[PDB]
C-alpha cells in the first residue's frame, strides 16, 4: 500500500441514476468526481477516457493499492450522485 496522486482505473457506469430517473453522462475530461476508496473519500479530476479505462488526478492523495475497488459520484443538480464504480489498475505514487 502506497500514497497515490493519480489512478489508472477500469470503470463501469450505470445506465441511469438511482431512486424515470435521468441517464448517466459519459466521463469528460476536467470534471471532478467524488471517489470513495475504502473508508475515505477524495476528488478525482478526469484526465483521460477510454471505453473501459480512465485516469483521474486526485484532488487529495490517499493511501490505497492496486486492485482495490472504488466508487464514483458526479455532481448532479448540486448533489453528489452515484454513477458507477471502478478498480485501480495503475497509480502514480509520491
Amino acid at each position: 500500500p502506497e500514497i497515490f496522486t493519480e489512478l489508472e482505473i477500469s470503470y463501469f457506469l450505470l445506465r441511469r441514476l438511482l431512486g424515470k430517473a435521468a441517464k448517466v453522462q459519459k466521463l469528460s475530461k476536467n470534471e471532478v468526481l467524488m471517489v470513495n476508496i475504502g473508508s475515505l473519500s477524495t476528488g478525482g479530476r478526469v484526465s483521460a477516457v477510454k471505453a473501459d479505462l480512465g485516469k483521474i488526478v486526485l484532488t487529495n492523495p490517499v493511501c490505497t493499492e492496486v486492485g482495490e475497488k472504488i466508487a464514483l459520484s458526479r455532481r448532479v443538480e448540486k448533489h453528489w450522485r452515484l454513477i458507477g464504480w471502478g478498480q485501480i489498475r495503475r497509480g502514480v505514487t509520491i
Binding site: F12, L13, L14, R15, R16, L18, G19, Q25, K26, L27, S28, K29, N30, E31, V32, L33, M34, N36, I37, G38, S39, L40, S41, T42, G43, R45, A48, V49, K50, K55, T59, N60, K69, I70, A71, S73, R74, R75, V76, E77, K78, H79, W80, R81, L82, G84, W85
Partner: protein, 301 residues
C-alpha cells in the same frame, strides 16, 4: 417561532461591523452575478481558474473577480477561511488538498463551495424552519474571507441566549472527548460569562440567538459566529425542547457540586460528519456489490 428576520440578522455582513473587535479579521466581497450563476450550476463539477490512445470541459473564468479575491487574501496574510452569508463548506473537507479548509486562491474556494451542501443550502434553502408567513426577502450573497487561524482542538463552545439571558453553554465538538475541558471547567465558565456580559449582551440584533466562541492559548475568548435560535442550529449536547422550555437546565445535583444559579448550564462530553464525504445516494464492499447488481438490472430494465 423563528422568523425570517432572525436568519437575516445572522448574515456575516449584518453583525460583523458591530463585533469587529472581538472576532477574526475578515473581508466581505459581494458575489458577482456570473460568479453566483457558476456556483449554482446544476451540472458536473469543473473548477474555475485552476492555473494513451472525448469532451474537454472548461469552467468559466472570472479575471476581475479572481484578482479581487487574491488581493483580499493577501491583505489577510495569504491564507483565508472561506464562508458564504451563513455557512462554511465544512462538509467538503474531504475533497480539498490535505483535507484542509485553508484556501490560498479563488480556485481553492471554488472546489470547496461547489462540493458542499451547506453552501448549496445557503443558496437554495436560506429560510428553512421559519414559521412566519412573510415572503422570502431578497438575499445579496457575499464571499466572506476570514483570516486563517491555527485553532486549538477542544476550545470551542456554543452559547445559547434567550431574552438576552445566557441560558446555556455547550461544547461544540460534542462527539469528541477532551480531558482539559473538565479540569478547566470553572475557568471556562467564568470567561464566557464575562465575555457575554461585556461584549455580546444587549448588542446583537435579537433577544434569542446562538453564538459560538473560541478560547485561545492565553485564555482570551473570541467570537466566531452568530446562529439563529431555532431548529436550523444544532443544539449539540442540549435539545431545543429544553432550551425553549426555559427549565432548570442544570439538572438534578447536590449542594456540594452545584455552583451559583445565575450561571448558565455548562455541558461537556464525559468519558466514553460521516455522511459529509458520502454521496446523496450513500462499508464500501457492500456498496460496490450493490452497484454491480443495479447495473445488470438497468441493462435489462
Amino acid at each position: 417561532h423563528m422568523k425570517k428576520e432572525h436568519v437575516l440578522h445572522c448574515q456575516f455582513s449584518a453583525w460583523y461591523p458591530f463585533f469587529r473587535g472581538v472576532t477574526i479579521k475578515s473581508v466581505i466581497l459581494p458575489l458577482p452575478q456570473n460568479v453566483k450563476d457558476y456556483l449554482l450550476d446544476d451540472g458536473t463539477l469543473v473548477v474555475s481558474g485552476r492555473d494513451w490512445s472525448t469532451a474537454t470541459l472548461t469552467a468559466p473564468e472570472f479575471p476581475e473577480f479572481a484578482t479581487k479575491v487574491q488581493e483580499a487574501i493577501n491583505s489577510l496574510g495569504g491564507s483565508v477561511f472561506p464562508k458564504l452569508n451563513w455557512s462554511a463548506p465544512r462538509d467538503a473537507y474531504w475533497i480539498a488538498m490535505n483535507s484542509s479548509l485553508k484556501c490560498k486562491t479563488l480556485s481553492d474556494i471554488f472546489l470547496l463551495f461547489k462540493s458542499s451542501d451547506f453552501i448549496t443550502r445557503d443558496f437554495t434553502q436560506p429560510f428553512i424552519h421559519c414559521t412566519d408567513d412573510s415572503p422570502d426577502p431578497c438575499i445579496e450573497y457575499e464571499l466572506v474571507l476570514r483570516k486563517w487561524c491555527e485553532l486549538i482542538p477542544g476550545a470551542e463552545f456554543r452559547c445559547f441566549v434567550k431574552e438576552n439571558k445566557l441560558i446555556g453553554i455547550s461544547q461544540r465538538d460534542y462527539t469528541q472527548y477532551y480531558d482539559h475541558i473538565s479540569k478547566q471547567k470553572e475557568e471556562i465558565r467564568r470567561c464566557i460569562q464575562d465575555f457575554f456580559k461585556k461584549h455580546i449582551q444587549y448588542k446583537f440584533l435579537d433577544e434569542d440567538f446562538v453564538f459560538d466562541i473560541y478560547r485561545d492559548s492565553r485564555g482570551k475568548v473570541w467570537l466566531i459566529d452568530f446562529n439563529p435560535f431555532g431548529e436550523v442550529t444544532d443544539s449539540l449536547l442540549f435539545t431545543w425542547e429544553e432550551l425553549i422550555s426555559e427549565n432548570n437546565l442544570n439538572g438534578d445535583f447536590s449542594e456540594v457540586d452545584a455552583q451559583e444559579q445565575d450561571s448558565p448550564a455548562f455541558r461537556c462530553t464525559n468519558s466514553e460528519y460521516l455522511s459529509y464525504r458520502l454521496p446523496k445516494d450513500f462499508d464500501a464492499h457492500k456498496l460496490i456489490d450493490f452497484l454491480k447488481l443495479k447495473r445488470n438490472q438497468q441493462e435489462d430494465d
